[PDB]
Ligand binder design. Structure first.
Ligand SMILES: Nc1nc2c(ncn2[C@@H]2O[C@H](COP(=O)(O)OP(=O)(O)OP(=O)(O)O)[C@@H](O)[C@H]2O)c(=O)[nH]1
Ligand SMILES: Nc1nc2c(ncn2[C@@H]2O[C@H](COP(=O)(O)OP(=O)(O)OP(=O)(O)O)[C@@H](O)[C@H]2O)c(=O)[nH]1
Ligand SMILES: Nc1nc2c(ncn2[C@@H]2O[C@H](COP(=O)(O)OP(=O)(O)OP(=O)(O)O)[C@@H](O)[C@H]2O)c(=O)[nH]1
Lengths: 100, 438, 427, 300, 438
């Protein structure tokens, strides 16, 4: 009849504050000139939060910086009813990832 | 040529129409699809169907009828029967509102915006026809809607044509049974409005129909299927003169010109003598003398009027099937000699006899047996005055208490008609005794 | 060929530019990257009304972003579609907004209008024949107003023969946060109405009321509001890109809607917004479509037109329709409230029927009607401006920037002229 | 050669004429869609006079159209098809009756054998239709009618049903690409041989077609359908790599097109003679010979 | 010979052109591919199809039509639909910008630089034409584009060719239904610019077609799949006499000479009597008498004008199928003797009958019937001046307030012409009044 707000977990969102993780990433590019766009991961154990970043690369060309702010990317293995956000328990060397 | 247009207004007319056209199609041999078998009778609309069905270049015998109904339930049912491809689509005029048993609700609030359509139908029949001998109007008086809209359509057809007969059947209000209490009100309203426009209005009663049923049909629990079937066979008999041929012949115009005595009084009664069952006709036997005696037995008529409490003045006998004229005239002479019967002076000749040779037909799975001789009897006698006596000393109490008039006045009516109707009826009964006396 | 180039200005021009372009891209099946994934033949066929076509099947959105603080530009950049935007178009300055209409109109824009004009005429040459440009900005928002006024002023002479369609957010009457907002609005509205032809008026409070009413979700984001407004704009955009019987032209709408030279300000309304259980609790019938379609609550621009009447109205409907239902509903709405329209032009209604449905739900529509429904808005801004100006507070900043009050006088004069014209025509 | 059209809806026989080149007709229609008398009645009549039925318009026939004796030789395939579909009033087309007819005679077996043997000289496994009709009329003493010989030729025809191959289609493709300046498939094929996303072997054609439409590959959708037909399998997942290698024009010759004239037509010049165009071109003996009496040879 | 040229100006003209052409190809069997299999109807390009096609050295039936439009959307959809391959490639003339409901937008801003191309196309058709009876032009008054462009084209072809014929059919704006408050503007502009060149123009109404569709055809949610197929049937009916032969024939020159009484007034009305659906045709009856009665029924018309509010001066019967002169004359004589119709004393007879034997033809996935007797109604009356009073008072208030005039002055319009329009209209008004006077 009448809705109500959902519930949040103070244990998750206060205990391990700004616990962050970093990784390096490679991509497959249409253009042959993009073979080594070494990209960086950043994970937050606050809301299973994910962000991705690009370091400036000296004199090789491509501008660096930010490709996407912190995002609750729903897992490609997370159906429309079940919102997983690529639980970091899956990340491993040479993993398989598809976002946007 | 020789054709009549059928009109059925109502709750009260749908099932009887269903039965009668089922009998029609059965007897002419129409397949309920509509066409003939490999026999060659489809044509330019001119063979035995040229009187009832408009079989046209499409090869389908199309009934020349219009049903108009206020409450779409039953008409949807009749379209969801089996003969729907037979019947004509917009000859089935349906509405969305009942007349709610109120004469004036039927005649004023809803009816007027339907007469345009019904007139369009009847005129598009009037253009095609050439003989247009008249109409067969089916309604009732104890009808929630068959009263007022029927009166209005009668008025318009009277004012546009006064050059064709007007035949009316009616299931009359039961004398002592009254399903509705608005029955006396709307019934007398219908009567006093229709007296000065109706050519031949005839009656029959459900109670006496049932009495015949459990008397000699050996049916203690009959139904509508049965009642409507009986009335349909009656009308089939009265139209047999039109359909088939015979030695001597009469027409509905002759009926009017030769049964009603005077102005006003044109409400006679009817009967069908050989009402028996399978085994009864099997090991029994009918013949002209006893069919005459039975058709004039006081109980066999379908209204509770004792002839010995009245006096005969007119009789029309229709015999159908094989017969010789000798016994016919001899038996009617013997009945003339009879001492229990009563003839007034005016009618030394009072017997209109009409013969058709073709036997009456049966309906499959029905009640009536095979028929060798049959008769339709149409008699007019003074006896029926007592029924109107009953109706008036009924209505007088309701008027004394001004009961139920609030509905009519609130939907917009005034005392004028309510007053007038009583002395209209009173003039009717006074004329009844004035002519009954000598 | 006819096509449109988009301009997004101010820190909410960012808001809506992001939401609007992403909505259209999702409608057209272009991935966030750009590699077109052709699944609707018609939209592939007519993509050129918005998009140029590049190699391998990516499509630049011919849209240009303008702001002052690089952080907001980088945020929208970081959005899921900043990659489908342009490093080309990423022109921007170095100063701070100061939320200052005066600085924006005279100091900050004086070194940005040049470059942005170069870019816009570059794109205009690049394409064949615009119908015009849609500009999404704010009137209360400081730098959006400061930029957009000058930009439209110059493009007016740049091309006197095209469509200068403008989209503006009305400050919340209950609160403007920024207290100089009435001053900015009175400054802007003058040049706005003077230069433009068609302006959209939207306010945040009514969208919040919708969110309470049928969204009922109780945890809204301005992003959800942007989602709504993106659908709103898409509704009027669908006509050109789509086949079937429909007069698509914005100039068609202009000549069918605008009775007088100086009538420009119009108010939107839109069609089924599906509630908690209405998905399976709502039968999609032209009666109920029109029922909600012409309703006071679902209206979300300014304020109940219950007080006023409707000068003229126009409605476009997306889906498989026929003319008889819209026709008969027009009869019913005219005969129901014979007074609620102006006698000034009988049969004041226009219809349009896009054959193409949206992707997912069968029937939708867009409403747009011009009415005497802005009197209360600018009378409100009148009382605010008068009450704050009578003691000329918060004015030494503007004196330092180089202003004076004669322009304030003439602005309020023109605005009161608008009030009088509305009142004398309708009343 | 006159158009006589039998209208089965009105029993009328339309007589129309086509203009010829440098001759003496300049005519055309002759009989306005009219029911016409049987040419076997009187002027004085008592009973219902008769009219031409559909019973006697058999192939190779005589007829009168109120005076003029018309003779009838040839027929069109659609008329033939409707002819054999329902044979109650058309027993002529029923070939099995001719089977019994020729099965009645037995003595002529070896005689037919040597006659047909000497007809050929190389055993080329075909035979000219004129020779066929002559020898069959001979064996029937001139008692067979045209129609059933036509039908039996139709049945035991030689099979020669072919279609244009890929050679034309690829040549036209090459030249169209030449016209469309976008000749270089360096811009397209390399982009594709990247853009294959999740591939091990072959790919659904619904992807190739859609990426073509996306890239605006210069071609008509009709030729798109034609080539996709010419390169397909049960699942429509062809080897896209060779698909693109062959559609590329890094090696090709260059033919071109003729007229669309009207010569191999049937109001223009092919043969318009007694073997009017040609019903069935060629036909072979041995099958029909075996079906008649071909015993004491091979299996029979 | 007997061949005509079709012009389809505008968004609306080109679509109903597609629909009617989809009709045309069937009754001569032309396939969506435009080539028959082996059978022969080809020749010297000279036989029944030669009225509308010219099947040239490639055996392709080529429409004798032209399609000019401003917005390329619909010409694109028909360049991608089912019939683009048969439609001749560059006949289908497309633009890039609309007309924006402004008359002067199509008459001063766009139509100038396209008229050259279109006149060149029509001349390189006229050369290969021999008989060239005339031009069937389709525009629309409230045309969201076509009105202004049609004005210019019509006036120039009139002035350059003052000897051949011009016939105009156009969907007429509704009495009360609105799609454009600007519609009165371009309606009156087109009228006062066209009444002095148009030979005869014929108006119908979408609402009226719809009303027919849900009274008799039983279509409760039509579109103009349905109603365009109806109008296509209408034009096929008027051109059947051209196509086929028969007892006695009729021609557009006769229409020009004999329908219109006087200069200026050349506005008749059109109707099709036996509009009827599947089951009604299947199992009901049609003949000349009732179909004539129906076509003279006052509500069957495509424009709401009351014949009792009017008076007739001309009628044209187009009887197609199996009809015969005796019943033709009997029906028309009965209609004459009937008194509801009130003919003026100008023409003691008011009838022009035309015969064709070939029945009309059905279309797959359609609504029409296997009708053997059809009749096209083309009648000129006096009931219509009410509509012009309607339009002028629908216009006068709105001009007196001068809404949207800024648009027209901005695109380069002044007000002398707008002034002139209403006295042209009042001229037509008093003209109808005076010709009615007797
Ligand atoms: N005429 C006729 N009457 C019947 C039949 N069966 C019962 N009746 C009686 O006929 C009456 C029908 O009258 P109404 O019900 O008023 O009929 P109506 O006015 O046409 O309309 P409704 O009230 O809506 O059905 C009932 O009161 C019954 O007493 C029948 O088969 N035929
Ligand atoms: N995307 C986005 N836009 C917002 C949001 N909240 C408010 N806005 C509004 O967008 C308005 C217009 O911003 P701009 O047009 O960029 O104004 P400006 O001239 O740059 O300077 P300011 O008015 O100080 O922002 C602001 O005044 C805000 O009121 C939000 O939460 N998200
Ligand atoms: N002939 C035709 N008429 C249509 C079609 N669809 C809608 N209509 C009718 O077209 C009429 C209006 O035409 P207009 O709006 O003036 O169109 P236009 O001025 O030629 O140009 P557009 O901007 O393309 O619409 C209406 O009366 C509709 O009944 C169609 O496909 N064909």
């Amino acid at each position: 009849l009448i809705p109500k707000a959902p519930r949040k977990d103070v244990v998750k969102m206060l205990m391990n504050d700004n616990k962050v993780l970093r990784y390096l990433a490679a991509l497959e590019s249409p253009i042959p000139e993009d073979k080594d766009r070494r990209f960086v991961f950043s994970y937050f154990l606050a809301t299973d939060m994910i962000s991705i970043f690009e370091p400036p690369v000296r004199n090789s060309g491509i501008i660096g910086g930010k490709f996407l702010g912190r995002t609750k990317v729903v897992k490609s293995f997370s159906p429309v009813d079940n919102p997983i956000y690529y639980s970091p328990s899956d990340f491993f060397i040479g993993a398989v990832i598809e976002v946007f | 040529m020789r054709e009549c247009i059928s009109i059925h207004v109502g709750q009260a007319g749908v099932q009887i129409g269903n039965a009668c056209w089922e009998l029609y199609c059965l007897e002419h041999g129409i397949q309920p699809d509509g066409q003939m078998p490999s026999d060659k009778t489809i044509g330019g609309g001119d063979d035995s169907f040229n009187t009832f069905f408009s079989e046209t270049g499409a090869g389908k015998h199309v009934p020349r009828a219009v049903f108009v109904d206020l409450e779409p339930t039953v008409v949807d049912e009749v379209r969801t029967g089996t003969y729907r491809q037979l019947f004509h689509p917009e000859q089935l005029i349906t509405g969305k509102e009942d007349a709610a048993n109120n004469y004036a609700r039927g005649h004023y609030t809803i009816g007027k915006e339907i007469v345009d359509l019904v007139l369009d139908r009847i005129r598009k029949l009037a253009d095609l026809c050439t003989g247009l001998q008249g109409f067969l109007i089916f309604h009732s008086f104890g009808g929630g809607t068959g009263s007022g809209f029927a009166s209005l359509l009668m008025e318009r057809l009277s004012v546009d044509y006064g050059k064709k007969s007007k035949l009316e059947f009616a299931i009359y209000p039961a004398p002592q049974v009254s399903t509705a209490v608005v029955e006396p009100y709307n019934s007398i309203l219908t009567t006093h409005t229709t007296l000065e426009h109706s050519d031949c209005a005839f009656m029959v009663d459900n109670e006496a129909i049932y009495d015949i049923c459990r008397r000699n049909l050996d049916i203690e629990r009959p139904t509508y299927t049965n009642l409507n079937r009986l009335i349909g066979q009656i009308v089939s008999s009265i139209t047999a003169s039109l359909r088939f041929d015979g030695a001597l012949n009469v027409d509905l115009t002759e009926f009017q010109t030769n049964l009603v005595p005077y102005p006003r009084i044109h409400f006679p009664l009817a009967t069908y003598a050989p009402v028996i069952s399978a085994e009864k006709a099997y090991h029994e036997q009918l013949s002209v003398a006893e069919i005459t005696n039975a058709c004039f037995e006081p109980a066999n008529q379908m209204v509770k009027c004792d002839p010995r409490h009245g006096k005969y003045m007119a009789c029309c006998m229709l015999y159908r099937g094989d017969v010789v004229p000798k016994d016919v005239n001899a038996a009617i002479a013997t009945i003339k000699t009879k001492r229990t019967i009563q003839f007034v002076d005016w009618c030394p000749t009072g017997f209109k006899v009409g013969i058709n040779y073709q036997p009456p037909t049966v309906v499959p799975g029905g009640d009536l047996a095979k028929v060798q001789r049959a008769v339709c009897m149409l008699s007019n006698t003074t006896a029926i005055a007592e029924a109107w006596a009953r109706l008036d000393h009924k209505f007088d109490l309701m008027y004394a208490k001004r009961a139920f008039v609030h509905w009519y006045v609130g939907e917009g009516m005034e005392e004028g008609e309510f007053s007038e109707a009583r002395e209209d009826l009173a003039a009717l009964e006074k004329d009844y005794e004035e002519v009954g006396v000598d | 060929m006819r096509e449109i180039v988009h301009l997004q200005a101010g820190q909410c021009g960012n808001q809506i530019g992001a939401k609007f372009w992403e909505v259209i891209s999702d409608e057209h099946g272009i991935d966030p990257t750009g590699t077109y994934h052709g699944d609707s033949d018609l939209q592939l066929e007519r993509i050129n009304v918005y998009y140029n076509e590049a190699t391998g099947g990516k499509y630049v959105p011919r849209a240009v972003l303008v702001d002052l603080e690089p952080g907001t530009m980088d945020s929208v950049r970081s959005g899921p579609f900043g990659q489908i935007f342009r490093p080309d178009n990423f022109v921007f300055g170095q100063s701070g907004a100061g939320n200052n209409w005066a600085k924006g109109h005279y100091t900050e824009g004086a070194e940005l209008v040049d470059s942005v004009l170069d870019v816009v005429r570059k794109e205009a040459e690049s394409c064949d024949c615009l119908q015009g440009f849609q500009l999404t900005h704010s009137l209360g928002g400081g730098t959006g107003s400061g930029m957009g006024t000058l930009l439209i002023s110059k493009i007016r002479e740049e091309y006197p023969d095209r469509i200068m369609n403008t989209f503006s957010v009305v400050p919340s009457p209950k609160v403007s946060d920024t207290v100089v907002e009435p001053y900015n609005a009175t400054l802007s509205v003058h040049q706005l109405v003077e230069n433009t032809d068609e302006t959209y008026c939207i306010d945040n409070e009514a969208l919040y009321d919708i969110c309470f009413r049928t969204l009922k979700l109780t945890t809204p984001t301005y992003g959800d509001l942007n989602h709504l407004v993106s659908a709103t704009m898409s509704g009027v955009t669908t006509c050109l890109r789509f086949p079937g019987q429909l007069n698509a032209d914005l100039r068609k709408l202009a000549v069918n809607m605008v009775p007088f030279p100086r009538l420009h300000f119009f108010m939107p309304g839109f069609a089924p917004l599906t509630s908690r259980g209405s998905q399976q609790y709502r039968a999609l019938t032209v009666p109920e479509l029109t029922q909600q379609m012409f309703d006071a609550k679902n209206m979300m621009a300014a304020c109940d037109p219950r007080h006023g009447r409707y000068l003229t109205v126009a409605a476009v409907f997306r889906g498989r329709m026929s003319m008889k239902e819209v026709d008969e509903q027009m009869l019913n709405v005219q005969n129901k409230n014979s007074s609620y329209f102006v006698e000034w032009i009988p049969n004041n209604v226009k219809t349009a029927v896009c054959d193409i449905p949206p992707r997912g739900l069968k029937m939708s529509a867009t409403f747009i009607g011009n009415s005497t429904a802005i009197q209360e808005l600018f009378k409100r801004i009148s009382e605010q401006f008068t009450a704050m100006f009578r003691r000329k507070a918060f004015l030494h900043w503007y004196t330092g920037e180089g202003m004076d009050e004669m322009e304030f006088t003439e602005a309020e004069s023109n605005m009161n002229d608008l009030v009088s014209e509305y009142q004398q025509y309708q009343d | 050669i006159f158009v006589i059209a039998f209208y089965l809806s009105d029993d009328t026989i339309s007589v129309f004429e086509p203009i010829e080149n440098n001759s003496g007709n300049a005519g055309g229609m002759f009989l306005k869609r009219s029911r016409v008398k049987k040419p076997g009645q009187e002027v004085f009549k008592s009973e219902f006079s008769e009219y031409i039925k559909a019973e006697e318009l058999y192939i190779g026939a005589t007829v009168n159209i109120n005076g003029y004796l018309f003779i009838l030789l040839n027929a069109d395939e659609y008329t033939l098809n409707y002819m054999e579909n329902n044979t109650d009033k058309f027993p002529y087309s029923n070939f099995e009756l001719a089977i019994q007819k020729l099965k009645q005679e037995k003595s002529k077996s070896r005689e037919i054998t040597q006659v047909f043997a000497a007809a050929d000289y190389n055993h080329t496994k075909v035979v000219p239709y004129n020779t066929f009709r002559d020898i069959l009329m001979s064996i029937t003493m001139g008692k067979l009618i045209d129609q059933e010989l036509i039908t039996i030729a139709r049945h035991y025809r030689v099979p020669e049903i072919m279609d244009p191959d890929l050679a034309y289609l690829i040549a036209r493709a090459h030249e169209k690409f030449k016209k469309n300046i976008f000749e270089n498939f360096d811009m397209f094929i390399y982009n594709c041989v990247y853009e294959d996303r999740e591939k091990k072997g072959v790919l659904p054609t619904k992807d190739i077609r859609r990426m073509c439409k996306s890239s605006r590959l210069p071609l008509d959708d009709d030729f798109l359908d034609c080539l996709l037909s010419r390169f397909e399998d049960k699942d429509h997942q062809i080897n896209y790599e060779i698909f693109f290698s062959v559609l590329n024009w890094r090696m090709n010759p260059t033919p071109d097109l003729q007229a669309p004239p009207y010569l191999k037509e049937k109001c223009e010049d092919v043969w318009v003679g007694m073997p009017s165009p040609i019903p069935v071109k060629y036909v072979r003996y041995l099958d029909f010979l075996i079906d008649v009496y071909g015993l004491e040879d091979n299996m029979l």
